[PDB]
């Protein structure tokens, strides 16, 4: 991978159509669009997410555990790799799979309540502390690896845990065997243990992704690159690892690419403060030598609204943000999501700040 990295992060939900001939045309237009953009890399959705409900029930590749909505991941991937001139990372959930209900789910401990529960507004994650979960998610990644050729894996941002998670019984067991108390409330009120517990959860998640990476590499070979999405807060306010279980230095040591969700509006930043926020993000990154050379900053191309809808970020604003990143010494970047159906973002408007050529 010769620098700079310039990433289009692409959902296939848009490309899918019940009409095979329409889906044909959609794929052709998408292939041409990526070709015309002239960038280095596509992060390509391997799972279906038609409702954005935080749980994957269907995927775009044949496999042993979940329905295949349409066999299109490999079809799009090989054409992007040969015709559009890009590396492809298979974008996969780490935890949020609609598998066997007897599999342990991540739970949180509600204030004033005895029994752990599933947090309503979080990804519907399986617990990485359940060995059956590790095996089954492993099978999904092996099925992907066996049925499609690609250049990398992008691990989804659903590999996170809050400061009241994971409260499930297998997680509790894991903490106890690691030397912590079985009571989350107790851990949370101990200065040293709370710090250590956050770190433990971060490593647990990272280790799980590395197990999955090894499984993929066993099949496709060791040349496969790894990337993982990290939330902005663990980068800019590292103490936030306490409620994300993500650690930036850990990502930098563990993956080829750390894909930072550099998305001010997602983080509640006022429109007029977005430049300052992006600049401060780049500043924090440069506190770690070579971090920028191992990080991709993913800008948002949509603004996601409270009531479930989203609207486009203007292409001119996206281009300005890209200009800003370059001027602050950040050369590796991209955006999410892409919408070929409406040429959003507008190829002609963003290419001068985006394209490698």
Residues near Cl ion, by CB under 5 A: 168-169
* Cβ at position 168, least distance to Cl ion in Å: 4
Nearer to Cl ion, 173 or 305 (CB): 173
* Cβ at position 101, least distance to Cl ion in Å: 12
Nearer to Cl ion, 167 or 245 (CB): 167
Nearer to Cl ion, 162 or 326 (CB): 162
Q: Residue 270: CB partners within 8 Å, gap ≥ 6?
A: none
* Cβ at position 103, least distance to Cl ion in Å: 11
E strand or H helix at 354 = helix 347-354
* Cβ at position 161, least distance to Cl ion in Å: 14
- CA gap 141, 63 in Å, rounded: 9
Q: Residue 164: CB partners within 8 Å, gap ≥ 6?
A: 108, 109, 110, 184
* Cβ at position 247, least distance to Cl ion in Å: 25
Check if the beta carbon of residue 118 is closer than 8 Å to that of residue 107: yes
- CA gap 293, 44 in Å, rounded: 22
Nearer to Cl ion, 167 or 319 (CB): 167
Nearer to Cl ion, 55 or 169 (CB): 169
Q: Residue 290: CB partners within 8 Å, gap ≥ 6?
A: none
DSSP-derived letter for residue 272 is G
Could you tell me the two tokens for 271? 């429109």
Residue 73: closest CA among 90, 86, 87: 90
């Amino acid at each position: 991978e010769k620098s700079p990295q310039r990433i289009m992060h692409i959902d296939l939900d848009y490309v899918y159509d019940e009409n095979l001939q329409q889906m044909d045309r959609n794929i052709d237009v998408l292939i041409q669009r990526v070709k015309d953009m002239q960038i280095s890399t596509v992060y390509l959705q391997a799972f279906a997410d038609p409702d954005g409900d935080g749980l994957v029930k269907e995927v775009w590749f044949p496999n042993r555990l979940l329905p295949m909505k349409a066999d299109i991941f490999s079809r799009v991937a090989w054409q992007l790799r040969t015709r559009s001139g890009v590396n492809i990372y298979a974008w996969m959930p780490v935890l949020s799979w609609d598998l066997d209900p007897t599999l342990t789910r991540v739970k949180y401990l509600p204030t004033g309540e005895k029994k752990a529960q599933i947090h309503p507004e979080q990804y519907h994650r399986l617990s990485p502390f359940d060995d059956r979960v590790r095996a089954q998610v492993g099978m999904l990644y092996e099925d992907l690896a066996g049925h499609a050729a690609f250049d990398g894996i992008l691990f989804h941002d659903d590999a996170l845990l809050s400061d009241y998670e994971d409260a499930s019984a297998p997680a509790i067991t894991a903490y106890q065997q690691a030397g912590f108390s079985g009571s989350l409330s107790e851990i949370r009120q101990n200065p040293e243990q709370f710090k250590q517990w956050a770190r433990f959860k971060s490593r647990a998640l990272t280790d799980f992704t590395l197990e999955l990476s090894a499984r993929v590499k066993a099949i496709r070979g060791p040349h496969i690159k790894t990337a993982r999405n990290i939330f902005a807060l663990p980068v800019i306010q590292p103490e936030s690892e306490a409620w994300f279980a993500q650690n930036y230095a850990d990502f930098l040591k563990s993956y080829d690419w750390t894909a930072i969700m550099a998305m001010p509006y997602l983080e509640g930043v006022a429109e007029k403060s977005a430049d300052q926020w992006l600049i401060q993000l780049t500043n924090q990154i440069k506190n770690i030598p070579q971090a920028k050379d191992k990080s991709i900053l993913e800008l948002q191309a949509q603004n996601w609204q409270k009531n479930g809808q989203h609207q486009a970020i203007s292409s001119q604003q996206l281009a300005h943000w890209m200009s800003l990143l370059q001027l602050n010494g950040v050369k590796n970047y991209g955006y999410y999501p892409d919408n070929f159906l409406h040429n959003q973002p507008e190829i002609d408007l963003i290419r001068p700040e985006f394209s490698t050529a």
